Amino acid sequence: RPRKYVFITGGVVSSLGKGILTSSLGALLRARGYRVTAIKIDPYVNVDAGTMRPYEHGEVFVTADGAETDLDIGHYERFLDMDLSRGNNLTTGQVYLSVIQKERRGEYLSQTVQVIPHITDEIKERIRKVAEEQKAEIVVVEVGGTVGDIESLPFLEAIRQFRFDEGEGNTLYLHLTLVPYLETSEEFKTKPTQHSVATLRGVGIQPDILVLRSARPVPEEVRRKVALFTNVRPGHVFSSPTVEHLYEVPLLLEEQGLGRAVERALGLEAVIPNLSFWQEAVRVLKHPERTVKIAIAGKYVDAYLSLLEALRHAGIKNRARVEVKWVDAESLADLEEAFRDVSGILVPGGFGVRGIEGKVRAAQYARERKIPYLGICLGLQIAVIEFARNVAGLKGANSTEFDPHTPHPVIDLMPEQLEVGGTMRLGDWPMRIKPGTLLHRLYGKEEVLERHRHRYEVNPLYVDGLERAGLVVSATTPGMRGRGAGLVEAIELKDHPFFLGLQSHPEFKSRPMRPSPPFVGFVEAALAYQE
Amino acid sequence: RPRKYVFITGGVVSSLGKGILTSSLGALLRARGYRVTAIKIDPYVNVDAGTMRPYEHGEVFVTADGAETDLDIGHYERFLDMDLSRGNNLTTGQVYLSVIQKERRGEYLSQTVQVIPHITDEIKERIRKVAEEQKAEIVVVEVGGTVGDIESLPFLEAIRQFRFDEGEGNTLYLHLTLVPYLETSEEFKTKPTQHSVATLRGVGIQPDILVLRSARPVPEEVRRKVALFTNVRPGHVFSSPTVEHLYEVPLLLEEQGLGRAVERALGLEAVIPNLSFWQEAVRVLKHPERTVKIAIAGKYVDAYLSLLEALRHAGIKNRARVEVKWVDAESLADLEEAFRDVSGILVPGGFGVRGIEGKVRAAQYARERKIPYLGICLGLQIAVIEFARNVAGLKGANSTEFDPHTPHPVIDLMPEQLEVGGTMRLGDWPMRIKPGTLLHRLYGKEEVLERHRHRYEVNPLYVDGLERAGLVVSATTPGMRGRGAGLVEAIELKDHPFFLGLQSHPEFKSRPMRPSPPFVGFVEAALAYQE
Amino acid sequence: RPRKYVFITGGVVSSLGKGILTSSLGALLRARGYRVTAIKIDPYVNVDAGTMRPYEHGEVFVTADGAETDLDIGHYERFLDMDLSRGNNLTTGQVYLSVIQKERRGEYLSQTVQVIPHITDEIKERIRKVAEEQKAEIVVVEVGGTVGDIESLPFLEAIRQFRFDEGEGNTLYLHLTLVPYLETSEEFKTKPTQHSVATLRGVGIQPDILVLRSARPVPEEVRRKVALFTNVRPGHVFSSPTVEHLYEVPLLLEEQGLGRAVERALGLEAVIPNLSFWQEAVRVLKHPERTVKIAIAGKYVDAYLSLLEALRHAGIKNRARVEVKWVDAESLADLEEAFRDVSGILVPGGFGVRGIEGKVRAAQYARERKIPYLGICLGLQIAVIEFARNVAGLKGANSTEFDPHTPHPVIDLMPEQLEVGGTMRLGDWPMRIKPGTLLHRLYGKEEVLERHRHRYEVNPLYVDGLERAGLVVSATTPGMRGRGAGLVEAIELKDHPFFLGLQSHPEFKSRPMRPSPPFVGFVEAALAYQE
Numbered sequence A, B, C: 001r002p003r004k005y006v007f008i009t010g011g012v013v014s015s016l017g018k019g020i021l022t023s024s025l026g027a028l029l030r031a032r033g034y035r036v037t038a039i040k041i042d043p044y045v046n047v048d049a050g051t052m053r054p055y056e057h058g059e060v061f062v063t064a065d066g067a068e069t070d071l072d073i074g075h076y077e078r079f080l081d082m083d084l085s086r087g088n089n090l091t092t093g094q095v096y097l098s099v100i101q102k103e104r105r106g107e108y109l110s111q112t113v114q115v116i117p118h119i120t121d122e123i124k125e126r127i128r129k130v131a132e133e134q135k136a137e138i139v140v141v142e143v144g145g146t147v148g149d150i151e152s153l154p155f156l157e158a159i160r161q162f163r164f165d166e167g168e169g170n171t172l173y174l175h176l177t178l179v180p181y182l183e184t185s186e187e188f189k190t191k192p193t194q195h196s197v198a199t200l201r202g203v204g205i206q207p208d209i210l211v212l213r214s215a216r217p218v219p220e221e222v223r224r225k226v227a228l229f230t231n232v233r234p235g236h237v238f239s240s241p242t243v244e245h246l247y248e249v250p251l252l253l254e255e256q257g258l259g260r261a262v263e264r265a266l267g268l269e270a271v272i273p274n275l276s277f278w279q280e281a282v283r284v285l286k287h288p289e290r291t292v293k294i295a296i297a298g299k300y301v302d303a304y305l306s307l308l309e310a311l312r313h314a315g316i317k318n319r320a321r322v323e324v325k326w327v328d329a330e331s332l333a334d335l336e337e338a339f340r341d342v343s344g345i346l347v348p349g350g351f352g353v354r355g356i357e358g359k360v361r362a363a364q365y366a367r368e369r370k371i372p373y374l375g376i377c378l379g380l381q382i383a384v385i386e387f388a389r390n391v392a393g394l395k396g397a398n399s400t401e402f403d404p405h406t407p408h409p410v411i412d413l414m415p416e417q418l419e420v421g422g423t424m425r426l427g428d429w430p431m432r433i434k435p436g437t438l439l440h441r442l443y444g445k446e447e448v449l450e451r452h453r454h455r456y457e458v459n460p461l462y463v464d465g466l467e468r469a470g471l472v473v474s475a476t477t478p479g480m481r482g483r484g485a486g487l488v489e490a491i492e493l494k495d496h497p498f499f500l501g502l503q504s505h506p507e508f509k510s511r512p513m514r515p516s517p518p519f520v521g522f523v524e525a526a527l528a529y530q531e
């Protein structure tokens, strides 16, 4: 049974929702029982998303293996319901760096190294390597950038070569384009699509399937015209209309027949997908039994893409619509009005002093006014800082990240004793939950894994005291590779309806099919608070 | 002093308002005192617009010389304020037919005839010939179609050759493209523009000026990015935002600096344009002293492009906003409600029986209820028919176009005596107005020219009787080339506030700077009726 | 059983021998028993080759139906061994003229007519119409021009559309390109091929087969590289090396596997071609039993393409190599040296006085010195003129074409009595051969058809006298459609080893498989003369 490859390119304009299309096709294939994996090719020169801002210009996703990748990997994980790794985000920097380092070591045996075939071999090899490791039966590869630009050329060439390498029936090429619709003229402009496919053909790729992005679905007559001038059969031209909920996409594509078309094109026996989860999730999103509002007091108010997705997953499970009120951390200054008509307060992650003191106030206000509180990473550090100051009377308490000279570094770098150097804790780390805690009630397990991306920890030296003040350490980590043994992973308050914080980013693991308990509980408590 | 040529191409999509851009640049140049002319190249194979439907799929304009052309010629005439001719609408059919007929006659002297240079020579020759006849100092040529399609290729090549033929400083190339704007992302997508210009460059043309069509104006920073990747200097990239009134375009383009950029590029001494007319016309359109509503009882409710423009011109002169209520002729069946809140009824032109009887009812209703009435071409024939039936008691009266067997053909083909064969009366025909009539009051002249396009006339044999019944022949034509001597050109009613009809299409000559009197009076009477 | 279409395009440069490739594939298919036909698309604007010079810039072929076409039709007829017609030479002029005339007649029903789909529909319709009339099972269509130029675009689009129209397995696309070979570097440059195919793909066509034109055959390794970067399978990339004899082409292509590849691609059951004729003809050309030299006293010394082919066909049948000595008619002035080592003199066709008197001398010299003489069309008129002057003593005798005022118009326009106006006799005309003549000995029939293209005939009024002088009219035509009844078609001399002339162009019908008797005899007589 040969491995199947489905490549996805985009044309006309850079933004078409190609990430969600890839994810949606991934879901339709997994809904058929196939073992699938998606690879996001990002033509940029950055080796990885590690040197970029973690939130500001859009969230940087973190995989179980600790890789910092493009946010699309998160989409992919959510729609396919599986962990991806560093190998699922391929960049120009990675490819050129390996090939270049390889020829400096003389491993190319004195020959002249070139984009073709050397850079292109590296690209294909990485695509196959990761698909092998994940035992994929079908692999969906999304080419970032836009057909017609310079950066994606090496990648378009690389994937073009797969048809010959893999043999007939094992590769399929899909191209997504923009079809402008004039509300007045009431007409769909297909020329951009025509020119884009012609350009793609010029580099050597003939799409087998086309998806036309437009405000509304593209009429059959129009789709036929496009089919005939592109060399794509009529039944292989589909629409990608704009929709209210992202979860609707897999459904509308399957209904039009994308799934069937794909199976056939790959010469696979027809399998009836089970889309029961998506259908119900979309039903819940369109008809919530109730709706509650919570506030996100962040300093970056797609910076919290995974966070917002996590809230949505929890909402669905609670059969409730979760409305988000964005509260600018720094502005925190009438809290009564800022959190008016708010049944929950969430303090997300971030770096830098900006907004810290503002978040501190939100936490205090949420602790005193018995308002559900969820703190993620920095959110926990904030809570620890606010508790340290106003409950343990540790005046000036803070994190050395914000005040390197505070007299009470309740949050500081990795303790020298627990170190092995100046690197963050990234990826999955085991978390031992304490029985009888709120954390325990939510998970229902005593041992779990959550993903991390931070360089500051709760200072051990202060734990004993804070606990005496009434702070509960509902979770700790046994460490990993002899590092961070004993570090605090979660904190909560006993005399509060819902006050929880975690050092990790549990949003990163949240899947619409399997919500993150910390968020499930947060939403549940919110609803409770709303009475 | 060399003749200057400004070529205008379009890219990305077929609809960008390139016709109005051409017209607007034409206006800015005439506002500088230059003798200008515009040529519309229509890549279609039709020799002319003569075999197309006159109204249904958009109006077919008629020039003073009787040529049936694309509607853009009308725009051109209105913005430049000058009559154009058959030579101002160049088509593929015209070009290939002349070259082909020429080689069949052996006039190419036994050589192999080809698209290049023979078809391209014909195109350039026609462009120069018409510009010469019109003594143009600056000629604006608009290339129909979209860069990247097959049909316009011979024309793009033809105009590319002008740079070398005319010598430096005498040719300028402008390209209009679509820049999609995402209301959400709040971003302008410039890739389509980039790809389009790259394609244009590929055929051999480097634009000197670019105009970016988009919902809103394109920011300076964005325009600079486009300038740098297209080879067009920053100061030569302009915006074409969507606007309320067409007359605003010349103004916004001049303000941004298109006029100045053009003069400079053509090496002409700066001239301060006088845009006083446009500024006031736009002021009137934005702030009408009053507004009246009139109904258009037509069978095609851009079929009446020139008609609606004519109403707008009249409105401006009357400093009033004219609201049009579309009344489907055929549906005419409660007239009281159909013309409710209507201070004027206009019955436009058309061919075919469809809606005739419905129009007849509108006329009768407008004659009895003393409601201002304006009938254009068919509009007059309708009025004559309704008057014949209900005032002269000529039962069954009609036009032989609708009832070839009516016992009273008050409207029929060109009288055999007045003929010279089965062709329509097209283009300007002299009209002798009768002193003391409503027609006379409106024009203020006794002799004028109006454009025609019809094959039916008021049957002479019935004039005497109809006049006795009370119908007034306020105009007749002395004929032309010994044809149609004596034919009725206009009719009106003495005992009515405003009841007028003309055989010609006076909308075709209406200019915003010089409104058509028949419409000026119609609007004036409407206002009167509204009290 | 579906009709199969094989399209042939050319890239990089205009001259690649694509005409002979088309012809050669045609031969391989007919050698398999298929009914085939070839259509030559000539992108030029000339409706037909009728207004071009008949010889000067290359011969203009004439088909049985009297059509004047591109010389490729001749190749086609020779390799396929079948008569083609006007419909086998499609031009831009024909296509645009029909569509244009059609819309002027309003036959497009008021719609806007465009290159696509109207011009393209006309092209496809003409291709199918002619294939139907000829009951073709396989049709080979050659696209003139070069991929990448403007003129052939409408045709490339037209043929691209056939794949969808005809359904899978019924269309095949072949592209011929130039692969430069550096004699020094000893390398084949494949980039031109790469860029050309990329351009072809850009217009929407993916070649299934490629033929690389180069000085020498392209190595397998190189062919594989081209296959991989063009999307064409390795076994479908072939070579077209330069060769000594044109007849070698079908053979080398079949040997490489073009025939097999084509049958398979069209989903046809393998048929073993019988290439026995070509193999022997090539054997004869490489190893002639003998060789003789004849002189061609023409005024255009590919003007005589069909003539030279006819000589080659005759040579093969006589198992002798025929060497041609070009003798410039006008220069005729030492005949002894001009015809030194010449065993035969041929005077071909032409128009105009230039060289007439020179040809006259060659004829006289050939008649007196008992040297084999073959006169084609003008060649016969010359002989009649020379005989009239020097044997019948008709001083000043001539053709009115050269001397409108000669006192003895032994050759003049179509006799007024035999006319029906000022048109030439074109295409096949029946020729009644007289028993016992040299003409009869050669053909072996009394009635045959030969193709014509001339406007001058032997003046009847002079026949009687010339016959008395000793001239023999070995053939006459019963006329056609009541025209030219009785006209002289051939003349010969009784007291001469070989002196023959014909009014028609028997070269046009000569096929390598079936030589034209007049030439067979001419060569035979030449050999005889050489002793």
Ligand SMILES: NC(=O)CC[C@H](N)C(=O)O
Binding pocket: A054, A348, A349, A350, A351, A352, A376, A377, A378, A379, A401, A453, A454, A455, A456, A457
């Ligand atoms: N993303 C975050 O929440 C980071 C919190 C803090 N900067 C740390 O390094 O721990």
Ligand SMILES: NC(=O)CC[C@H](N)C(=O)O
Binding pocket: B054, B348, B349, B350, B351, B352, B376, B377, B378, B379, B401, B453, B454, B455, B456, B457
């Ligand atoms: N356009 C018109 O108004 C045409 C009216 C009528 N068909 C005529 O030929 O006179």
Ligand SMILES: NC(=O)CC[C@H](N)C(=O)O
Binding pocket: C054, C348, C349, C350, C351, C352, C376, C377, C378, C379, C401, C453, C454, C455, C456, C457
């Ligand atoms: N091609 C020819 O041989 C033409 C001969 C001569 N011009 C004729 O019209 O008969």
